[PDB]
């Protein structure tokens, strides 16, 4: 119990680490140095050499939806909707720095599979938005959701 | 209670099929193929190489040709018949020696040799491994319980284009007269990534925490 | 509305593979195994697969791995141009200023298309 | 006067040191994403109406030559059918993502997005863009000048 | 020096012209058109409306047709001959009254009636104005020196689709017998956005800091 | 590779204007001036111009402004479907729970295409 | 339910406001400008003129412990342990910027009443640490805690 | 359970009494005094002044002497017989007029005239009010539901030394013939802080959210 | 160990009050009601009650309020020196550069000890 | 050079790492958990075991003013103004988290040397503020400032 | 108040600190080889017994000296003097994630008697 | 230009001398003492301990007495004649062995054995070293280029009370018949902290960047 308290403390301390925190609210061009311009325009997948903390590395079991997403991305490539390099550039770079680290790995793969359908006009955004509504309605009406939820 | 990801997965998959981009049979076929995969073929390639100098030469020079001997044809094994779209068709095999030890990452994402090795580990996809291994590889490898002499060249291989790698470790002491099967058994997934070395008696990856899924495969 | 050719890559690559399907398309390589080359810091707007950590470093080419369109072109659907890709070994001391002299021999190997390379 | 300038500089500085509980985010597992967070990470960045913010002194800003040239490029690209303004808004104000959306300047985003439409609709390869940037920097370095930005 | 933005701007412009996407003449023509724009026509539209009740009804019901009377044709004044791509062809004129006072924003970006009013102010584009006006308008207006009785309806117009607005304020006291020129002179840019009301003897926007450009137009 | 039609818009809008070029294409309007409508919380993934702060609020239609494709379509190059747009006035107190009782008459007006509207 | 969702959203996005966040870890003297020196050495009670957001002002009911703390502080002053100026300087300034805004108002008053006892050596820190243990054991042994907890 | 603050309060209080610094009786005396306090004496001072011009002159010139007439002697009313240690003995009364309207803060903490007015409100102690009122007083007052003509001088008084203030508002219309009791009834706490003005019929502060305590007085 | 005198303040103040107990101790005031004074930006290390927002501003003295030790001395237990305190009115426009000219007459009044004041 | 730009870039994108950032503004006592109470009342110096990243370690040349501050602090103890343990407690704990990590190591030693003179009443705060005024005037006048600035 | 500035120098000159406190703690409660757990005593305002030790058990390896506790000395209170012990802790006992590969690693630090209890 | 730190340092020093708290003499004498300090005596203590087993047992049991042999008397060398106020009089010398290797830190600040070792390095004072060494010592040591067999006990000493440590490393191979001078030469500051081991031919700390002072000693 004492030890768990110690470890919770050490975790909490870190959130109070002092910093000079400058919120950015669309600064004028005179506030952007070449250094800043290179950093804002970086592709965020390029992390090698950045400093980071120790972690106990873990395995993770795969969600049904993650396996399905992986297969969807590869089948879209098999059938010529995109190449994997097109996927990597949309999924690991175009998503931008915030979503790149805030959302989970296969979250990004899945958002980017939706994205290719709309960007190449295989579906309209209206069709995607309408289909999400349909899926939520299938669920609420007790009709089930594929392998995720029985009727 | 389905999550937002489950809702959007079903939406995407139904739209793609409705619009004739891929079929439900395509998707089943791909998932069926993925379920076949695992690290045994790659362990077998290393065992065969430890037993046949000519085949070890082929592994080091032409990993794609060498993979055929353990049943993984990087072109024709996958359902596309043109290699998988994400892992391509250029396997290279990295040979450790008494003065060289390799370990692999994809700092840009998670590129990994799925056709011959199976699923990439969670931690391999992590930003944390992707940041640190390239720049502090002795520190990271020590966390996995591996240290080498300071004069041994540790080489980190960063899989940033179309090549995928497996590590062929040195054959360990205490394996005189072993058969291909006994040898392959100690070449674990972690040995093939390079964060572990094969040891007689050790036939599974070192146990570590497993993060559970809300709803599993 | 534009129409996307969904059969092109399968026509070209089926039974051959990627990047085998580009073999011969780059012509003559500019560099050879054993050449020392420095990584040019080309503009990286929107996409690159040549990591920042390599820019301006010198390394040695150890293999001509395959021919392929550069990812900067393939990821925007442009595959008309094909170039040689090289596997380059860098000394870790040349990448990270802090790297210990005790770990004298440690290296990093990665792949770079010809467009990033200049003679050292 | 100089002292008042130091006073307002001080108020601006102390705001950088306001205490906070700051949680870095590092690719969480899907089990750590709530509906609330899913909706917040997938929000369209431009939609800011009603967000809390502080009083700020509002200022005017002179137009830069490059901002006027960017604005005219973006409208000429639409005049001539490369895109509609709605396509521009969606690329410029939403698809840039939250970090660039608030970290870069307003016409910075217009200019990046003008380069973006040329590449995404394949009018120019990314290689052509990267090479043109290389060639422009060499122009500046050489003393030969760069249009109205820099006389030879 | 030259900035990264100046180098990118010349790269995108030279590439667009090399690829025939627009011409060098198109770009010069567009900049020449933008240089014509400013707040004088909108102020004259308001002054004419105060002086002629039938023109005022035309402004409130059909701002596009009314605009023609001050030389701004929303279809044919811009070089396109189909309105400017970003400001469209649906001006609405919002008429204040003794019980109604309007102020305009575009919370999603900076949409503003450029053809009849000219350049949007820097502050009008700020994330701060865009967050706060829709929710605390009387706080924001009071920062601009404008306060109104609690009973007057303040209506914020959020320009989020293809309509652009100008505000036609109430004509103030102290202007008996004034001419169109005298009335127009007090209707500033700020009065047409709604952050100021017109006052006799005030013929310029309220002074505030001007952040200077590195290379100004 | 795909080809983009660059003359479509100019051919349709020249001499006429946008959104005037879409006049008549929406057919009959579903709602009328003075109608009370609630804003549906439709999925907003990737793009919307119906601000979050309106969702689920009820307001009054004050004007049928024009016909146009929805921006959620136009911003992805899809102009086949054209719908009516309505100017809606909301009471401030209905949007913002903390809005002062002192300022009881204050409102917000903004435009919303028909797809977001339902009878209140 | 939709409106509640909208308002939770507007609260959540604030947390993702981008910023240039520089953790400070004992920077060298060459990294401290006169501007920074004046800011780090400021007294933190001096807030007037700082920008802040709207809030709906509320009243708050007083905790028994808050009333007792206020009395303790005034009685210590009545009986000559300190003056209220000494209290303000310790409570509103010496606590430092982090505690000044991280802890509650009467939290600060209470921590500073404890501080004066130790700083002027009316009690040793050992006696204070020992008394906190005593209070916790009184509670744990079902013996109650003054007016907060009956036996 | 009990909180860390409850534990530390008991500890401090028991040590102080053990070391002879104050007694248990002193502590009870002080809490009993605080429980006596409230805004009625100050409302009475304002009503008396509205009814007697000589007494209003004294309020404005010497608030300490004036306060005696409503039974609050700032020296001798508190248990010390030297004024309370934290609120001292220099009350000033600020007289509003048709061209001047005052509002009070302590930007440095929460200094407030407890001997004549009772406990300070939570929001008055808040960093938010302490930051904003000095610099945007018309904006903050408008949130409290108060606006004044723009030519009226709003004066903010920041109580940063030993003076404590109350506001004497102007006597409102609609109070002809009223008695002292009727007038005092409409002078609420908020009127005496200056965030509200007295109105016939309104005898309590504006209702606002009350944050509840874990364990109340 | 040092001994603290716990009776001194009650002996001096009982029946008199604070700041009455210091009356007369500051001597002749340096300034007078109606003088224009500027606030000196004295070092503020460890403690001050002269808010940063006033430093370098000019205001008018409207009252000599009382004599007292400065809080910078009283808060460290030093009460040997006593000075005059002044109530000073500033125009809001002289404090906050953004303040609106429409609110021409708004002011701020606060107290400052003599040590911070110079003739304007 | 290009390499200087590369390491500058890695340092810059660390400033733009995504976070959930909750500003704190004097919360009510009901928002303070035990965990947070313990974390706000921690002694700042106790940092062992906190997570941190690898950093290049450097040497730093001693400033004249650092050597002078060190000698002042030790001479104050030699001559009985304090013991080093009093110094450590004032210097490394009572300064609070923000200054503790925001200011330089000998900046804290120097501030704390000024602090002990005031807190034990050897010097009034007025004498210290006045001495700072007079030192700045000495610098401004051209008359020099000891070994820091010749006349 | 008057601060005595000569007390420390009078007692420590020619002798040193903590040598000037020798014998003032009386009998030690614990002995070399004893296993002791570190009490999580309140740490308000000051402590030199690091949080990362609290509740851990380790082995006493040396009775290093006698001195006032720093929790006392740092506030000018030197009347009470206690024994100080050097403790060795196994790293695995402090840090849950410590590698099993590095099984033998330890940390040694000093703790005054008030924080110790028999394990 | 002189910094705020230089101004404050002269203010504190002139006030302490004016008030008689220490003398101008005292301050010059202390700086002269600090100038005499450095890593040479601690290195000689280790070389003598390697050359004389009775002296090594004296070092391990009684570092204070042992220190006298290399001319550092922890009581009488400093000007106080009672040890330095901040480093005290209880040196312990930690003897590494083939199964034990020590490294030292002060997690609470920067406590270091100045009288026998000289100035603490900048990095030893960093919050980064102070956080990480106690918990990940093999990660930190490996950043300094030191790794040891997984079975060797690494012992971190945290100098949190009045003891200061130096590390007496094991004497390395390749030094047969070496003299005291030759052995002392390889025992650098870093070897005495424990972040390096002594090696024939290495007589200086590992090079790293030196951050320059604006006005250096
Ligand atoms: Co990858
Ligand atoms: Co806009
Ligand atoms: Co106060
Ligand atoms: Co230390």
Contacts of A133 in chain F (CB under 8 A): 42-43
E runs forming strands in chain L: 91-95, 100-105, 153-158, 164-168, 210-211
Contact assignment for K69 to G121 by CB distance below 8 Å: no
Distance CA J57, CA J48 (A): 17
> Ligand 4 centre from L120 Cα, in Å?
10
Distance set, CA F6 to CA A76, A79, D88, F9, J143 (Å): 28, 29, 15, 7, 75
Best probe of the L interface among J3, J55, J60, by most L CBs < 10 A, is J60
Specify whether the CB–CB gap between G37 and I39 falls below 8 A.
no
Which CATH number does the domain housing residue K32 bear? 2.30.30.50
H69: Cβ–Cβ under 8 A, 6 or more apart, which residues? H45, H48, H55
Chain E residue closest in CA terms to H143: E139
B59 has binding-site annotation: no
Q: What is the DSSP letter of H62?
A: -
Distance CA D105, CA D100 (A): 9
List the structure tokens of F119: 């009878």
Q: Among K44, G69, A10, A11, which Cα is nearest to J41's?
A: K44
* Closest Cβ opposite residue E147 in set H136, H138, H143: H138
If phi over 0 gives left and psi between -120 and 50 gives alpha, with beta otherwise, what is residue L130? Answer: alpha
Phi, psi (degrees; rounded to nearest 5) at J93? -130, -50
Contacts of C68 in chain B (CB under 8 A): 161-162
> Ligand 2 centre from G13 Cα, in Å?
20
Chain H touches chain C, with at least 3 Cβ pairs below 8 Å, answer no
DSSP lists the bridge partners of residue C68 as C83
Specify the 3-state DSSP secondary structure of F94.
helix
C98 touches chain L (CB under 8 A): yes
Chain I touches chain E, with at least 3 Cβ pairs below 8 Å, answer yes
Contacts of B160 in chain C (CB under 8 A): 49-51, 110-111
Q: Among F109, G66, C61, I54, which Cα is nearest to E133's?
A: F109
Range(s) of the domain holding residue I44: 1-120
Q: Among A97, E110, E109, A94, which Cα is nearest to D93's?
A: E109
Distance CA B93, CA J82 (A): 67
C-alpha distance across the termini of chain C, in Å: 48
Specify whether the CB–CB gap between K4 and J80 falls below 8 A.
yes
Domains and CATH numbers, chain G: 1-151 (1.10.472.20)
Distance CA F116, CA I30 (A): 72
Give the neighbours of chain D: at least 3 Cβ pairs within 8 Å. A, B, C, E, F, G, H, I, J
Phi, psi (degrees; rounded to nearest 5) at I59? -140, -170
DSSP lists the bridge partners of residue F107 as E155, F91
Range(s) of the domain holding residue L198: 1-217
Alpha-carbon dihedral of residues J91, J97, J99, J103, nearest 10 degrees?
90
Handedness of CA G79, G81, G85, G90 (dihedral sign): negative
Specify the 3-state DSSP secondary structure of H186.
coil
Number of domains chain K is built from = 1
Number of Cβ within 10 Å of residue I97's Cβ equals: 12
Q: Among L184, L217, L216, which Cα is nearest to L200's?
A: L184
Longest Cα–Cα distance of chain E, Å, equals 59
Distance CA B168, CA B47 (A): 9
Distance CA G24, CA D22 (A): 13
Specify the 3-state DSSP secondary structure of E15.
helix
Q: Among G90, L110, L73, L3, which Cα is nearest to J87's?
A: L110
L106 classed as catalytic: yes
Specify whether the CB–CB gap between B162 and C85 falls below 8 A.
yes
Chain G residue closest in CA terms to I95: G49
Contact assignment for K40 to A10 by CB distance below 8 Å: no
Contact assignment for K80 to G129 by CB distance below 8 Å: no
E72: Cβ–Cβ under 8 A, 6 or more apart, which residues? E41, E115, E116
L104: Cβ–Cβ under 8 A, 6 or more apart, which residues? L94, L156, L157, L159, L165, L166, L167, L193, L194
> Ligand 1 centre from B41 Cα, in Å?
21
E191 classed as catalytic: no
D41 classed as catalytic: no
Annotation: binding site of H for Co(3+): 106, 109-111
Specify whether the CB–CB gap between D146 and D139 falls below 8 A.
yes
Buried b (16+ CB within 10 A) or exposed e, A78-115: bbbbbbbbbbbbbbbbbbbbbbbbbbbbbbbbbbbbbb
Contact assignment for A85 to C44 by CB distance below 8 Å: no
List the structure tokens of L168: 């007496």
Buried b (16+ CB within 10 A) or exposed e, J38-49: bbbbbbbbbbbb
What residues pack around ion ligand 1 (CB closer than 5 A)?
B 106, 109-111
List the structure tokens of F117: 């509207």
Q: Among H137, H56, H134, H138, which Cα is nearest to H97's?
A: H56
Contact assignment for E5 to A28 by CB distance below 8 Å: no
Number of domains chain H is built from = 1
Specify the 3-state DSSP secondary structure of L93.
strand
Contact assignment for H30 to G65 by CB distance below 8 Å: no
Distance CA E39, CA E167 (A): 12
G82: Cβ–Cβ under 8 A, 6 or more apart, which residues? G76, G116, G120
Cis peptide before I19 (omega within 30 of 0): yes
Q: For C69, how many CA atoms within 13 A lie in the half-sphere containing its CB?
A: 20
Contacts of G21 in chain J (CB under 8 A): 15-17, 19, 21
Q: H53 burial class (0-12, 13-18, 19+ CB within 10 angstroms)?
A: exposed
List the structure tokens of G102: 């991280």
Place of tokens 């873990």: A58
Contact assignment for J102 to A18 by CB distance below 8 Å: yes
Q: How many residues are recorded in chain G?
A: 151
Distance CA E152, CA E135 (A): 17
Residues of A in CB contact (< 8 Å) with G are: 16-24, 98, 102
Q: What is the DSSP letter of K35?
A: E
Place of tokens 């994402």: B109
A123: Cβ–Cβ under 8 A, 6 or more apart, which residues? A117, A131, B15, B19
Helical packing angle, H24-35 and G64-78, nearest 10°: 110
Number of Cβ within 10 Å of residue B52's Cβ equals: 14
Per-residue HEC secondary structure of chain D comes to CHHHHHHHHHHHHHHHHCCEEEEECCCCCHHHCCHHHHHHHCCCCCCCCCCCCCCCCCCEECCEHHHHHHHHHHHHHHHCCCCCHHHHHHHHHHHCHHHHHHHCCHHHHHHHHHHHHHHHCCCCCHHHHHHHHHHHHHHHHHCCCECCCECC
Nearest-CA distance from F6 to chain C in Å? 10
> Ligand 4 centre from K73 Cα, in Å?
16
Distance CA H105, CA J83 (A): 42
Specify whether the CB–CB gap between A49 and J10 falls below 8 A.
yes
H165: Cβ–Cβ under 8 A, 6 or more apart, which residues? H91, H92, H93, H94, H102, H104, H113, H157, H159
* Closest Cβ opposite residue E155 in set F10, F108, F113: F108
Beginning with the edge strand found earlier in the chain, give each strand of the sheet holding I107-113 in spatial order: H100-105, H153-158, I107-113, I83-91, I58-68, I36-39, I117-119
Give the neighbours of chain K: at least 3 Cβ pairs within 8 Å. A, B, G, I, J, L
> Ligand 3 centre from D142 Cα, in Å?
64
Distance CA F48, CA F73 (A): 9
Specify whether the CB–CB gap between A65 and A110 falls below 8 A.
yes
Give the neighbours of chain B: at least 3 Cβ pairs within 8 Å. A, C, D, J, K, L
Distance CA D3, CA E94 (A): 45
Distance CA A94, CA A3 (A): 43
Distance set, CA A111 to CA A90, B7, H177, J99 (Å): 10, 12, 74, 43
Specify whether the CB–CB gap between L101 and L148 falls below 8 A.
yes
> Ligand 3 centre from G88 Cα, in Å?
9
Q: Among H190, H211, H29, which Cα is nearest to H112's?
A: H190
Report the alpha-carbon angle D87-D90-D95, nearest 5: 130
Best probe of the J interface among G63, G88, G96, G139, by most J CBs < 10 A, is G96
Q: Which of G40, G57, G100, G105 is catalytic?
A: G105
Best probe of the D interface among G3, G16, G43, by most D CBs < 10 A, is G16
Distance CA H12, CA G107 (A): 13
Contacts of F3 in chain C (CB under 8 A): 2
Specify whether the CB–CB gap between J29 and H3 falls below 8 A.
yes
Radius of gyration of chain B (CA): 19
Q: How many residues are recorded in chain E?
A: 217
Q: Among J35, J58, K53, which Cα is nearest to L135's?
A: K53
L131 touches chain K (CB under 8 A): no
Place of tokens 């029946």: I15
Contacts of G38 in chain D (CB under 8 A): 6, 10, 13
* Closest Cβ opposite residue I41 in set D3, D11, D57: D3
Distance CA H152, CA D13 (A): 34
Cis peptide before K18 (omega within 30 of 0): yes
Q: For K92, how many CA atoms within 13 A lie in the half-sphere containing its CB?
A: 8
Distance set, CA A30 to CA D62, D150, E3, G120 (Å): 11, 17, 9, 53
Specify the 3-state DSSP secondary structure of B55.
helix
Which CATH number does the domain housing residue H177 bear? 3.90.330.10
Distance set, CA B135 to CA A13, B129, B196, C79 (Å): 27, 10, 18, 33
* Closest Cβ opposite residue K8 in set J46, J83, J120: J83
Distance CA J65, CA J85 (A): 22
B139 touches chain K (CB under 8 A): no
Contacts of L146 in chain C (CB under 8 A): 102
Q: Among D63, K73, B160, A100, which Cα is nearest to E9's?
A: D63
Nearest-CA distance from G42 to chain I in Å? 7
Q: What is the DSSP letter of H171?
A: P
E runs forming strands in L60-163: 91-95, 100-105, 153-158
Contact assignment for A106 to D30 by CB distance below 8 Å: yes
F16: Cβ–Cβ under 8 A, 6 or more apart, which residues? E75, E82
Cis peptide before C19 (omega within 30 of 0): yes
Specify the 3-state DSSP secondary structure of E77.
coil
Nearest-CA distance from F99 to chain D in Å? 12
Contacts of J125 in chain I (CB under 8 A): 45-47, 72-73, 75-76, 78
G141: Cβ–Cβ under 8 A, 6 or more apart, which residues? none
Contacts of F42 in chain A (CB under 8 A): 129, 133
Cis peptide before F19 (omega within 30 of 0): yes
Nearest-CA distance from D61 to chain I in Å? 16
Specify whether the CB–CB gap between E65 and E110 falls below 8 A.
no
Distance CA E62, CA I69 (A): 72
Specify whether the CB–CB gap between H205 and H190 falls below 8 A.
yes
> Ligand 2 centre from D52 Cα, in Å?
20
Distance set, CA B200 to CA B172, B175, F43 (Å): 7, 7, 56
Q: Among H47, H20, H9, which Cα is nearest to H179's?
A: H47
């Amino acid at each position: 119990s004492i030890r768990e308290e110690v470890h919770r403390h050490l975790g909490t301390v870190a959130l109070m680490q002092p910093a000079l925190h400058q919120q950015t609210h669309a600064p004028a061009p005179t506030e952007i140095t070449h250094t800043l311009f290179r950093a804002y325009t970086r592709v965020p997948h390029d992390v090698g050499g950045e400093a980071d903390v120790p972690i106990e590395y873990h395995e993770k079991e795969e969600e049904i939806w993650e396996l399905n997403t992986f297969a969807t991305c590869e089948c879209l490539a098999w059938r010529g909707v995109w190449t994997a390099e097109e996927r990597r550039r949309k999924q690991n770079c175009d998503v931008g720095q915030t979503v790149y680290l805030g959302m989970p790995y296969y979250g990004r793969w899945l958002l980017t599979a939706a994205r290719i359908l709309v960007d190449k006009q295989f579906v309209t955004l209206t069709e995607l938005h309408n289909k999400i509504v349909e899926m939520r309605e299938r669920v609420a009406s007790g009709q089930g959701l594929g392998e995720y939820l029985p009727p | 209670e389905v999550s937002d990801f489950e809702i959007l997965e079903m939406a995407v998959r139904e739209l793609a099929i409705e619009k004739g981009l891929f079929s439900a049979e395509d998707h089943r076929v791909w998932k069926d193929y993925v379920h076949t995969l695992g690290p045994l073929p790659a362990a077998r390639l290393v065992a065969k190489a430890w037993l046949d100098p000519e085949y070890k030469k082929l592994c080091i020079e032409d990993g794609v040709e060498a993979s055929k001997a353990v049943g993984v044809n990087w072109v024709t094994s996958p359902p596309t018949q043109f290699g998988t779209p994400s892992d391509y068709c250029n396997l290279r095999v990295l040979a450790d020696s008494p003065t060289l030890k390799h370990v692999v990452v994809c700092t840009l994402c998670s590129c990994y040799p799925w056709p011959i090795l199976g699923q990439s580990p969670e931690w391999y996809r992590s930003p944390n491994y992707r940041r640190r291994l390239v720049r502090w590889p002795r520190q990271v490898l020590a966390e996995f319980g591996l240290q080498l002499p300071s004069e041994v060249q540790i080489r980190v291989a960063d899989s940033n284009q179309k090549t995928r790698y497996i590590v062929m470790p040195v054959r360990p002491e205490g394996t005189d007269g072993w058969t291909e099967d006994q040898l392959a058994e100690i070449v674990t997934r972690d040995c093939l990534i390079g964060v572990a070395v094969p040891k007689p008696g050790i036939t599974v990856n070192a146990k570590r925490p497993v993060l559970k899924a809300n709803r599993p495969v | 509305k534009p129409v996307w050719d969904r059969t092109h890559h399968a026509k070209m690559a089926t039974g051959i593979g990627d990047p085998q399907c580009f073999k011969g398309m780059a012509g003559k390589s500019k560099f050879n195994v054993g050449d020392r080359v420095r990584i040019k810091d080309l503009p990286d707007l929107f996409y690159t697969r040549t990591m920042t950590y390599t820019r301006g470093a010198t390394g040695t080419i150890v293999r001509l791995v395959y021919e392929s369109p550069a990812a900067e072109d393939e990821a925007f659907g442009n595959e008309e141009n094909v170039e040689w890709f090289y596997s380059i070994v860098f000394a870790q001391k040349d990448l990270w200023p802090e790297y210990s002299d005790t770990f004298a021999n440690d290296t990093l190997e990665t792949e770079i298309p010809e467009r990033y390379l200049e003679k050292a």
